[PDB]
Each structure stands twice: as structure tokens, then as C-alpha cells.
Subunit: 349 residues, 4 copies
């Protein structure tokens, strides 16, 4: 029950408004909910829709007229018109036209670029050029200069993933503009850092983000194959039966690629059904290859190559593989884990 509605109570409340006071006893229960109840909702975007809308944006939106920023943000229908896939993460399909380029800038917001279709584009990160091709993860960690250049007449699509919404809501955003279009097969970073178990004596200092600028498909694919093969041979490897998986890591530390974003890659055997999880924080998956479905809040959605979906905080989810089902994954878990808010419920346990 509320206080008696009296002229004195109404005078009290008008003083409140005047003095920027909001009394706790008037607040709606879910200021402190029983468990996380996001304004973001579970949502799927179909690739066939996204690619068609991206191609059209290629025609209608040239460089000089918005073409420098040709990226289709996935907007969660529960987040009020904000171009946010979740309360922490921005995810967009960047569509880079034949021969297009972008100049250098840096920003405090952390970012990756996961290559969906195409080849022969380079993203240049602190002057070091990083070739892009299908299945590759590129990082452009916060405060690193990044521009790019298409070396080809072909378009490319990648997922443009950032902590923009966290950074916007929390007031951490900074931004600077920057000041040869070399096309090396591999970046300096990779040439130093992508030898397993080995660390240059010139890079003995730990870093906050990975110095690996590209995690190439070859290696991702090979790691996942080896886990399934080790499973066949009776050896521990996979995380769950038929479920091979890796986390992309900062090799100086063994932890996440960047302070705010975790990236992983999963492969499921045909037939695999994962146990239902509730996890704090939001995650986004993209179907890289294969066919299957997701269950979110008990609702099953079938999924095809390229489809993308978001699980907001604490929404119970699982995946079923119809064929071999390869998925790229990102989430805000490093944030929940750094601050001791992370929590996990699994149907098995």
C-alpha cells in the first residue's frame, strides 16, 4: 500500500519533482528484479534478408552519399529504436563495395570484424596490413588506428562487432581521426605471434588486447576437426558430446581477445543437441555453415547458413544440429566475469 493521498502528500511530491528527488517507495519492483529480465528480446535475422538489403544498400548508397558507412546495424526490437543488438553489443553487416577504402581513425570502443563472404580486402591496424577472407576473425582493439582498402572488383561482407552500446551508456567513448596500399599475405602481428607456444623476446610485456590481428579460418577449422577426431579416438577434447569448441584468446595472457568482448567458434556433429543454458549477459551467434535450429524461451527457430541471433541475459537457450553446424559466437561475458556478475545454470548439472 502507498501513503495516504493527502494535500500534504501531494505537496511533498511536488517538492520532490522540484528538487530532483525520486522516492524509493514509488518505484516498480523490477528496479531490482528476481533474475535478469532484459528489455532486449531474443531475435533472429535471416541472412537471405540481410544479404538482399545489403546488396541494395550497395546500389543506393555510394561513397560520398553515406557509402563510407555502409553497415546495417541489427537493432533489437526491445531496445527502443537504439541500433543495439543487445544492451552491451553493437553488431552490423558491413558491405564493402568494389575497390572501396576508408581512412584511419581510433576509438576507445573495442571491435572485431568477422569475414562472412569475400576476399582481398585489407584492414590496416596501426600501419600493419591484415588481409581478410571468409572465416577469419580480425581484431581492431580499442585505441588502435584502423582503416581499410578493397584490392578487388568484388564486394565483401563482414560482421562489424563492437561494445558501442556499453560504451555509450557508460560514458567511456573517445574518438580521433588519423593523419601505400600494401597487400602482404600475412601481417607483422601474425608473423610474430602465430607460432604455437612461442613468444618473441621483444614482446615479453603482457597487453590488454590480443596482438594477433587475424585468427585465420585454416587454424580454427583444424582445431575443431582435431577435437572431433580426438573424440572419435576416446580422448577428452570436446566440451560436451559431439560439441567441439574453441575460444579466441590473447596469447600474452591466455584470456579474452579484448576487455569487453569474448569470441568463440563452435562445431556440432549432425544430431547434437546442447543442454539448455541460462547465462548472465548477452551473446550473439552467426551460422557459418550447416543447418539446424535454436531454442530460446522454449521457442524453436530453424536456422540456415548466415543466420544471426541474439540471446539476452538469462534467456534459456540451446542449439540443435541437423547437419554439421559451425557457429561463430561473441558475447559481453568478459564484462560480467570481470565484475563478478557472471552466473550459469545448465540443465545437465
Amino acid at each position: 500500500m502507498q501513503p495516504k493521498d493527502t494535500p500534504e502528500l501531494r505537496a511533498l511530491y511536488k517538492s520532490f519533482e522540484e528538487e530532483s528527488i525520486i522516492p524509493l517507495w514509488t518505484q516498480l519492483g523490477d528496479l531490482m528484479p528476481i533474475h535478469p529480465k532484459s528489455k532486449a528480446v531474443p531475435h533472429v535475422w535471416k541472412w537471405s534478408t540481410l544479404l538482399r538489403l545489403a546488396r541494395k544498400s550497395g546500389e543506393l548508397v555510394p561513397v560520398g552519399r553515406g557509402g563510407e558507412r555502409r553497415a546495417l546495424g541489427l537493432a533489437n526490437p526491445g531496445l527502443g529504436g537504439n541500433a543495439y543488438i543487445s544492451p552491451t553489443m553493437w553488431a552490423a553487416i558491413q558491405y564493402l563495395g568494389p575497390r572501396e577504402t576508408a581512412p584511419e581513425h581510433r576509438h576507445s570502443q573495442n571491435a572485431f570484424r568477422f569475414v562472412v563472404e569475400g576476399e582481398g580486402v585489407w584492414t590496416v591496424v596501426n600501419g600493419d596490413p591484415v588481409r581478410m577472407s571468409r572465416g577469419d576473425l580480425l581484431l581492431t582493439p580499442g585505441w588502435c588506428f584502423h582503416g581499410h582498402m578493397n584490392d578487388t572488383d568484388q564486394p565483401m561482407a563482414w560482421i562489424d562487432g563492437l561494445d558501442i552500446p556499453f560504451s555509450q551508456q557508460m560514458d567511456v567513448g573517445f574518438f580521433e581521426f588519423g593523419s601505400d596500399y600494401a597487400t602482404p599475405n600475412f601481417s607483422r602481428g601474425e608473423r610474430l605471434w602465430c607460432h604455437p607456444g612461442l613468444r618473441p623476446l621483444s614482446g615479453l610485456q603482457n597487453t590488454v588486447a590480443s596482438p594477433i590481428g587475424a585468427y585465420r579460418w585454416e587454424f580454427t577449422d583444424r582445431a575443431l576437426t582435431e577435437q572431433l577426431l580426438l573424440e572419435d579416438e576416446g580422448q577428452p577434447a570436446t566440451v560436451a558430446p559431439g560439441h567441439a569448441a574453441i575460444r579466441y584468446v590473447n596469447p600474452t595472457t591466455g584470456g579474452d581477445v579484448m576487455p569487453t568482448l569474448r569470441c568463440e567458434f563452435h562445431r556440432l556433429r549432425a544430431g547434437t543437441e546442447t543442454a539448455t543454458r541460462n547465462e548472465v549477459g548477452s551473446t550473439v551467434f552467426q551460422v557459418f555453415e550447416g543447418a539446424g535450429a535454436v531454442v530460446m524461451n522454449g521457442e524453436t527457430t530453424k536456422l540456415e547458413k548466415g543466420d544471426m541471433f541474439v540471446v539476452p541475459s538469462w534467456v534459456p537457450w540451446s542449439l540443435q544440429a541437423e547437419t554439421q553446424f559451425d557457429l561463430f559466437r561473441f558475447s559481453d561475458a568478459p564484462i560480467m566475469e570481470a565484475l563478478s556478475f557472471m552466473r550459469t545454470k545448465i540443465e545437465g548439472q
Copy 2:
């Protein structure tokens, strides 16, 4: 410039709305600002207003009719009607009437209670009772059961500080209800942990929040006196000339009281003027004793005993002491520092 406004462009945009896509090239620059530009604004609340409105709430709002929740939230005028002092922090004046009590609950949100006026109330934290009096900091770290009981006919006011707005925006909130009104002079926690330099062999495990339930005024006052005294004697101690200061810490670790909130206490000699700082993240100060002013965005506001004010992200601020000027401080810095978003500009350097 934007793409040509054509029937095809308008069809593209209507497909966007239908498919929950928001194109980057339509977005307003400050999705990624040049430096943090908060929606929260610098604001001061006068104690004499807050105490008068609190007393009236005591009369008008009894237990059974909202009295269990008698706390006046400081609402930032730039945060849209949300009861948030800043985008990360909730700060409220809790007004506890003669003999009032509250039962036990726990929530994932972290919290402290800093005692402004009054005595002989106990907050009971995981069954351990913590006496409260003026100048004391109490913690109720996340997921710890806490209720309270006034043992007296006198009211008490404290600052009720939490990471509610971070927790609400980020989807990390959990909440449980709980299931003798002992009145020990000191808590078990204090009796184990408040011997300088000494650690019980039964508490060798590090914790995520401090096991000290109260940081009593005596010690705070004594530490600040010693720094000014060491300054008089030519010995390094104070942070800046005439500026004594402490941070409240988790003694198992030496770091912050809780994962999301930093607390500190400052004492300035009469005459002291601090150098202008820009810092990422928001901070709140309360004047504990003395007289002076603040400068925020170049605007000077005079301050009296009890006044409270907020500096949102990157707003340049400094303090001037007219008399000896004691201030309690909290901020979301452990969040900015954990995620490598923290940044500092000082006018000296």
C-alpha cells in the same frame, strides 16, 4: 551528405524498419563521441533541502504504507526520469524512523551505507550485526543477506549507495528474500579483520568484496590527521599539498571495497584548492564537515555540511576548502579500471 531521396531509397528504409535494421549512415555522430559526453549533468543537492524532505517523509510515510522503503533517490536531471544519480550509480538518503526494522534479503547489486546522522542502529549482514554511527562506512556486498533494526527512539539518516543503474542497464540483477536483535558493540567481521597488518589463518582465501563490515569514523579520522601531521613534519603522505586522503579497501587483496564501487575519504586544509581533473566514469561526493565549494564545467557552487554532488564522466572538476573540508566519495572507477576504459587528465601534469 545522405543517399538520394528516391522511391527506391524509401522502399529500402521501409524494409529496414520491417526487418529491425538501422543503417549506420543515418546515425548521429555522437554514437561514438570525441570524448565522453554524458546525458547526466553535474548537479548539487543541498542537505537542508534533503533533510527537510526526509523529515516530512518520516511523518507522511509510515511503515505499512511505504515506510519500509523510506529512501529519497537523488535523480540526475539529465537521466530521463530514472532514479539514477549517474548512469552507473544509485544514491539515496535513507531515513529510518524511531524503532524501525527491515527483514533480510540479498541481491547481486553491490551496496554501502554511509552514516550521516544518528546512532544505535544495526545492519545485520549474513547474521552478523554491525552497529552504525555517524561517519561510519558499512558494506553490504552483493549476495550477502542484509536487514536492519533501530535500537532507539531516534531517527537515523544514511547514504544508501548502490550499482543499481549499471545492474539494471546491463541485465545482472538477482534478488532473494530471507527466512534475536543482538546489539554487539562490534561485529564479528571487525573483530577478525580490523587489526592492522594481521590476517586470521582461518581467512586465507581472498574474497571479491571486503570482509570488513564497518569502517568506523575513529580510524578514518585518525588516518587523515596523521597524513596532515606527517605533512607538517616534511614527510611524504598527502596526495597533493594540504590534501589528505584515503581509499577504503578490501583487506584480503588491497583493492576496492566491492567490484563495482570505490569509496574514499578526503580532508583538505583550509585554503586548499585541488587541481582540475577530468576522469572517466562518475563520482559522487558528500560534505561530511566544513565549508567550501566545487567547480564543475567552470561553474562554482558553494557547499555546506551534508551537501552532495555528482561529477559525470569527463566533467572537469576541483574542490576549494574554505575551512577544513572533509568529504566522503564514491565512484564507478573499479568498472572503468577493470575494463581498461579509465583515463585521467590533471591540470598540473
Copy 3:
């Protein structure tokens, strides 16, 4: 069995000697023992012997003729004439005569001074003077300048504890000579750092050793009393029944006083018998007050006020209290724990 003893085998072995080769197959099993088998043996020194020999050293050994170095090293009878209490630790009774002084030096070896009898001596540590009295722990962490001065006509005895034998065997030793006899009641370090739960904003950097120069008896005694009192009240506190105990810690970190040495203080209720432990590494106890015994390798030795004893690596030990039994303790455990060699067996578990 060994290789055939042939002229060719003997020629092989003479080539070995010539070329500084020692073949594994000739080595005695205990190059890699089944469990630690120290050359150091369990040993007790009686205080009444040590004090009598110390007094005589006071008469016979004046300043100018060895008096600057008047310290009686406890030499383990199994360590070959080396002045080592154990393979890692040096422990000596320093006997400081009326009005004696020592000038400043520093060395990489870490050291403490635990005051057995006497008062009004100061050890000056990086120019900061630290009063000494019975029951106090002083640190002189490695590479810190330290000299001292007796301000009185009375002698003082303290335990002079160092990692000298580790440092000597491992080749880490460095040593420098240094370049007012102030007598403050408390040191600068203490005045900054001995306020429970509080950390100066001017000392936000973690250190490798404690910045607390003295851990005074008052606080040690009070902590131990509180644990026994909390035990009386049914509250968890003591490590084992009737067994109160603390660890001295570096307050910036919550870990050990210095990188190589751990210090602790135990109080046992009359009647308390501890469960038998095997622990890797050596430890030394001193009886501060009370009466009881120790069991080492099944052999019981009765103990009086001032007695000192060493438990080398893996020797099973326990303590029995006849009266209330207060003991100071040091060990090389931070070394075994840092390098993942630590191991513990308890008779309970």
C-alpha cells in the same frame, strides 16, 4: 647392478673425471628421494642456554672487537658447520648492549627482527625510525637501508631472521654500505598503514614487501584474544579448536610480509593438542609465553618461554599446550608456494 668392472670401464670413468662428467647410473637413489629427506634435523635450543651465552658474549665481545656483530646463529646440527637453522633460513639471537648503535647498509637478503626482551631501541629503515619493544615484529625488507641505535642503558635481545642460506646457495646476494638519532613513538610507515581497512591515496601502488615496519604486540595480542572470545561465543574464528592464529601480511596485497619469508603468531588454549602436520619447507617457532611441548618425528620435547625449534621439510610435527601457549613462527613457505612445490598432510583429513 653396475656395468662390468673392466679396464675399458675404468678408462671410461677416468675420461669422465677428466671431462667433468658424472654418469647418472652411479648416483645414489636419494638424488630424487621418495619424499623430502632433509640434511637438517629437528632441533630445540633452550632459551636459558641462549640467554646465558648471549650475556657472556656481551662481556667478552665489545664494540671494536666483534661487538657490532654480536649475534648467535642457531646452527642446525645436520647442515655441516654452516650457520644455517635450515637450508633456507638463518636465525640468530642478536644481543645489543647498552647504548650500542650500527650504521646503515642494505642487502638483497630479506630480514625481520622479532623483539624478545627489552625496549627503547630504534631500527631506522630508509631514514624512518621504528621503535622496538617486546613482542613486536620489525621488517627490514630486502634492499632497504637499515641501521639501529639503543637509546638506553639496558641491553635488548631480538631474533634476527633472514633468507641468508637460500640467498647464499642460490647466488642472489648483493650488499651496499650506507652514507640525528630521532626517537618517535611510531614510524611514518605505521602512521600511514596501520589504520585497518584504509589505504593512503599516495600509496596506491602495490609493493613486493610490506610497507609496515612494525607489527606491534598490542595488535597481535588483541587479534588472538578476539578469536578465542569469538570461539567462546560459538562464532567461526580460530583455525582449529582452541587454536587462535594470525599471519602477518603485506597490506597492499594481503600476501606475505616478504617474498621469501612467512611470519605468523599462534595462541593455544591450555589443553590444546594440534593435529600432526607434514609440510614442505622448513619452519621455526619461538615460545613467546607459556609452557608446553612439541612432537617431531614422534619425539616429544618440553618447551619453556623463549625456547626455539626447527621443523625441516616434511618432518611430522604438532604442539601441545600445558598453559596458554603463545608462539611466534617463521618459514620459507612463500618460496615453496610461489614455485608450486608446497604440499601438506594433516592427520585429521
Copy 4:
């Protein structure tokens, strides 16, 4: 000067001997030296001597008659007959005959096996078999079961490196005996862990030693080539001009292979002369390929393929390359660094 040599002084000293007391004032200065002065001396072993003595041991010392332990320990001439290369490290040339095997054991002492000549031997580590060939580093971290099996009629030589002397002097040694001769091309460990930048979701827990059982030559060689190539292109990479180098690391952490031993591999361009270093702790190098010399204490020794040498604590050293000069390196630095005893002087700086 010493105390007066009196009958009373002699009685004092006889009481000392009786009571296991050694007085400080009688001790020789270098109990606490000015800088490290090892009993170990700089020493070189020639490969042509070591291989010839190893072959002869193959003839004279069969299995059943010492052949199970056919390893030639490098004994430092200053370490008193102890089979120690330095005060912390044991280094031996293990010579494994045609078709020989060894059963499983484990010990707390940490160990590696760096393959000098030969192929088709497997060391089986916790049931997982690790093929061995020239240039490969294998680990058998402490407390891991390890046996081996030669699958061939050819002998193999490897460097058998351990922290035996530290473990022996410090009392940390434990040892257990253990209870198909599979010959996989690659180990399970490698198949999980040797994909650059990728970490199995099933191995998210950090470990104290590397889970990589072999660091194969291919990758080592490729990393060193890339650094010299990046040097040619004007890009930062090498540690010093013409000096390419890597550290072998634990991929869960980015730190050293094991708690007590660091391993590295250096490649110098023909002509390269390194600046003189003093470093705390001992190191051992082996010439893998090429020709050059070392300078230790100002004394130059020419070096050929296979030669091995030790630099004890603080001995100034440098390397000159005549040809391209590849060297494998191990040291006790993780011990000096963990305990804050490490120190470095370089002639450049």
C-alpha cells in the same frame, strides 16, 4: 679485529660448539657478498667429447647393468663433486640405445628433454605419447607420469634438463613409480593446444606448467626466420640487431614452461655480437647449429655445433656469431623473478 683470545673466550666458544651456536662475528664476509659470487664457474663442454663418451657408454653400459640410466651429467667443476651444472640446474646427455624403453614414474622435480640427434622415440606423458625428433623441446612437467620407448634400431641423444639441484638443496623432492607402445605422429596435447591464438573450451582452467608436450622444430625455425625477415623489411621484431629470439611459453598463461625453468631459442646473423650482460641466476646454452664463440669473465671460447656452456649468477657474458648461430637456452630465471631477486645489467644501457 676479534675479541681478546682469553681462557674465558675459549670456554665461550667451546660452549658454542656444544650448543650448536655459530657467532656472526667469526663469519667470513661473503656470507652476504657485495654481488653474487658463485661456487659454480663458467665452463664449456665440447660436443665431440660428449658424443664420444656417450657412444662408449652405449657399449659398456647395457640395460640391466645401468643402461636404464644412461645419462652423462655435466658436473660444474666448482660444485664439489655434485652432479650439478649450476646450483639450481641438472643438465645431462641422455643416450638412448636401439629399441630401448623406460617405465613410468613421476617426481616433483620439473624436467624437459631437448632433442639433439635422432628420431622415432616417444616419451609418454600421462598416457599421451609424444614423438621426438631433432630440435624439438619436450616437457615432462613435475608430477606428470613419464616413460619412453625407442621405435627404431637407431640411438638418440637428448639434453635431459631438470631443477634437481634446487630440489635437492631445498627439500622439495617427491617420487613415485608407475603401474601398448602407440606411435602417433602428434600428441593429444599438441592437437588441442598448438593452433595459434585458439584455446579449447574444455581447457579454460589455467595450469602451472604448459599443456604443450612438444614444441617442434618447424615452428621454432619458422618464428626465428620471420623475425629476421621482419628485420630486413624495417619492422620491429628481433630483440637486438641481428638477434632473433623466442621464449617457449605455457599457452594458458603466456608465462614460462614450468615454475622453475625458462627455455628459449636464439638465432644470430653471421657477424652479430651481443652486448655484455650480467644476470642473476644461472643459464645454460647449447649450440644447435653454426659456429661462433662466447665471452665469459672476459675469456673467449670458440664454439661448435653441439657445444654446451654454463654462465653462473652474475658472470658477464656475450655471444659472437661467425656463421648463423642457433642456440637453445635454459635457466633458473623463473625462480629469481618469482622471488624478486632478478637483476640485470646490460653494457648498452
